[PDB]
Amino acid sequence: TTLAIVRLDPGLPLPSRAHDGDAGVDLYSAEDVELAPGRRALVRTGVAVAVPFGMVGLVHPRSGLATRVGLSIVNSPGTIDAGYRGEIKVALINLDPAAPIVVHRGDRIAQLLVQRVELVELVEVSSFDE
Amino acid sequence: STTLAIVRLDPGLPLPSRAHDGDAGVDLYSAEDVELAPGRRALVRTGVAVAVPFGMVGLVHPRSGLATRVGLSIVNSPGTIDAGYRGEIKVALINLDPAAPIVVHRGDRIAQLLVQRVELVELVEVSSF
Amino acid sequence: HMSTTLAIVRLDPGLPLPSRAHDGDAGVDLYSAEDVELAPGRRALVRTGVAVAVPFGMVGLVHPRSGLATRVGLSIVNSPGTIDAGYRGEIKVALINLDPAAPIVVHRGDRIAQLLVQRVELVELVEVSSFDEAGLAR
Ligand SMILES: O=c1ccn([C@H]2C[C@H](O)[C@@H](COP(=O)(O)OP(=O)(O)OP(=O)(O)O)O2)c(=O)[nH]1
Ligand SMILES: O=c1ccn([C@H]2C[C@H](O)[C@@H](COP(=O)(O)OP(=O)(O)OP(=O)(O)O)O2)c(=O)[nH]1
Ligand SMILES: O=c1ccn([C@H]2C[C@H](O)[C@@H](COP(=O)(O)OP(=O)(O)OP(=O)(O)O)O2)c(=O)[nH]1
Numbered sequence: 178t179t180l181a182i183v184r185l186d187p188g189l190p191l192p193s194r195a196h197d198g199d200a201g202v203d204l205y206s207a208e209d210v211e212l213a214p215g216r217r218a219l220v221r222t223g224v225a226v227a228v229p230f231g232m233v234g235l236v237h238p239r240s241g242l243a244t245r246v247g248l249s250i251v252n253s254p255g256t257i258d259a260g261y262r263g264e265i266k267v268a269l270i271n272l273d274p275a276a277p278i279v280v281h282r283g284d285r286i287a288q289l290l291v292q293r294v295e296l297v298e299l300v301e302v303s304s305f306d307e
Numbered sequence: 308s309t310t311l312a313i314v315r316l317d318p319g320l321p322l323p324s325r326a327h328d329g330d331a332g333v334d335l336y337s338a339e340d341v342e343l344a345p346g347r348r349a350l351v352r353t354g355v356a357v358a359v360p361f362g363m364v365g366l367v368h369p370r371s372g373l374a375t376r377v378g379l380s381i382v383n384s385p386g387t388i389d390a391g392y393r394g395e396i397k398v399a400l401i402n403l404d405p406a407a408p409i410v411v412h413r414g415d416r417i418a419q420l421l422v423q424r425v426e427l428v429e430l431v432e433v434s435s436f
Numbered sequence: 437h438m439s440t441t442l443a444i445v446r447l448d449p450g451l452p453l454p455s456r457a458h459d460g461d462a463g464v465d466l467y468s469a470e471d472v473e474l475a476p477g478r479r480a481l482v483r484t485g486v487a488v489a490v491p492f493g494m495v496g497l498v499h500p501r502s503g504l505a506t507r508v509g510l511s512i513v514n515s516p517g518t519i520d521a522g523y524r525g526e527i528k529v530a531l532i533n534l535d536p537a538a539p540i541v542v543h544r545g546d547r548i549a550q551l552l553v554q555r556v557e558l559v560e561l562v563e564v565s566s567f568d569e570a571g572l573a574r
Contacts (some may be wrong), residue, residue, distance in 0.1 A: 178557045178558075178559050178560070179560050179561075179562045180559040180560070180561050180562065181562055181567070181570055181572055182561050182562065182563055182564065182568055183563070183564055183567060184563060189397045190565060191561060192561060194558070196520065196522050196526070197492075197522070197558075198492045198520060198521035198558065199520045199521070199522065200495035200518050200521070200556045201518060202522055202559075207406045215403075215405045216342055217375070217378060217403070217404075219375045220512050227567065227570075227572045230328075230329050233331035234497065237514070238513070238514040238515075239514065240387055240514045240517060240518065240530065243513040243514035243530050244479070244481045244530045246337055247479060247513060248513075249377075249513050249514065251374040251375065251403060252370065252371045252375070252380070253384055253385075253514075253515055253516070254368060254384070254385055254515075255371060256331050256332060256368050256419065256421070258327070258329060258561070259329035259330070259331070260327050260328070260330065260574040261574055262573065262574065263425070263574075264568050266375075268371065268402060270476075271377075272403075272479070272513060272532060274477040274478070278396050290556055291557040291559045292423065292554065292555065292556055292557060293423070293424065293555065293557065294331045294421055294422070294423055294469050295363060295421075295422040295423060295424065296309075296325070296329070296331075297309050297310060297333075297422045298308070298309070298310050298311070299310075299311050299313050299323060299333065300311065301313055301315065302312050302313065302314055303314070303472070304314060305312065305314065305393050312461070331438065333506060346534075347536070348506075348509060348534070348537045349475055350506050361459075361460045362437045362460070364462035382500070382505040382509060382510075382511050382534060383499075383500040383501070383502045383505035383506075383511065383515075384500070384516075385499060385516055386502060387463060387499050387502065387550065387552070388462075389460065389461045390460035390461070390462075391458050391459075391461065399502070399505050399506055401534060403517060416482075423554060424555065425437075425462045425552055425554055426439040426461065426494065426553045426554060426555065427437070427439045427440050427456070427459075427528055428440060428442040428553045429440075429441045429442070430441070430444050430453065430454060430455065430456075431441045431442065431443055431463065432444055432445070433443045433444065433445055434445070435445060436443075436487060436524040
């Protein structure tokens with residue numbers, strides 16, 4: 178499958194899959210931001226994508242940063258719908274009780290996966306079969 | 308074209324729906340009013356039960372707007388709905404804001420439900436990699 | 437459906453092999469290899485005593501256990517944890533106590549997470565100057 182991607186911010190590298198078989202491509206921060214303990218920010222990644230119909234984009238936290246500094250994503254896994262053509266934004270939060278997180282423009286702050294989704298049709302029933 | 312059987316345990320709420328074609332999830336409603344003080348959690352009823360087909364999994368995800376705007380999260384995200392489960396879907400909401408309480412009223416949309424295939428892998432112990 | 441195998445190594449042989457508790461359950465439970473106490477707001481990187489070989493074309497996903505999320509506010513900082521197809525190391529779980537007041541005590545042999553395996557689309561990114569110009573312009 179291909180994923181069309183617009184670099185809204187041309188100063189950042191194109192997201193790339195570091196190893197073959199890696200699930201995600203890393204997303205970059207377009208901005209310098211400091212998160213005090215317990216505080217959050219909505220951070221621009223400088224990209225937009227066109228997730229194919231029948232698929233979903235998923236924004237996951239990076240594991241390294243998660244343990245080392247307690248960086249997380251409030252709405253994790255972030256859900257990118259097929260019809261979304263805006264900028265991908267990452268709702269970062271510092272879950273460390275005492276130390277700030279310094280995020281720089283150019284840092285890898287999340288990863289983007291693409292998977293198939295079942296666009297189920299909901300059928301209301303009165304009860305389930307037992 | 309897969310169908311997802313659903314029961315409104317709470318008949319007074321709208322049926323969950325896909326806002327646009329292609330959207331991965333359907334929004335779940337709260338059946339209840341809840342106030343979450345900063346850092347507190349609550350297990351909130353949605354008024355629905357579903358029948359995830361065998362070979363698939365139900366996934367409860369946070370909504371992006373409330374996440375940023377008020378710091379609303381889900382403790383066990385992504386909430387895993389197994390194919391054998393036929394009880395009420397409940398959402399473990401938590402307030403990750405430091406100072407501002409979160410108000411949820413009955414009828415608010417508090418989460419989204421995705422359905423995916425899952426690989427029901429058979430584990431095989433090996434000596435080494 | 438009929439799936440494949442997942443090769444698994446018990447780096448810690450005193451723990452039980454993860455298993456699927458019921459036939460169509462999405463996940464298998466992972467165990468803690470360690471005793472650890474998490475004070476309110478504190479996290480730890482907890483060893484599970486296992487390594488896996490997620491098939492190429494797939495991803496392993498580490499999800500929190502719902503039960504403990506509710507009873508005690510246990511969560512996973514990088515949820516869902518992403519286990520890449522090429523990883524052969526030990527699976528570790530970034531546990532965090534989201535309760536404001538009660539410590540969480542984790543014992544060796546306790547179930548601390550679940551592991552799912554799914555297909556993933558190993559997309560090839562194609563840069564386009566704009567969606568409008570690409571014919572892709574909710
Ligand atoms: O909950 C997890 C998540 C990941 N991992 C392992 C598997 C994976 O392939 C690797 C890296 O994960 P990720 O890409 O999320 O973190 P990173 O900070 O980007 O580290 P790396 O440079 O190793 O990718 O670490 C775990 O043991 N447990
Ligand atoms: O981490 C994320 C998650 C979402 N989005 C964008 C993509 C997506 O299609 C849209 C809506 O996300 P979601 O459906 O989670 O939020 P909502 O509060 O339910 O908004 P909506 O009313 O637009 O569905 O916002 C992001 O940029 N980053
Ligand atoms: O956000 C969620 C997550 C799970 N469940 C339901 C679905 C699922 O199949 C069941 C899990 O029950 P169980 O008591 O087996 O949980 P556990 O064994 O403590 O952990 P897990 O749910 O992670 O298997 O509860 C929900 O209603 N909402």
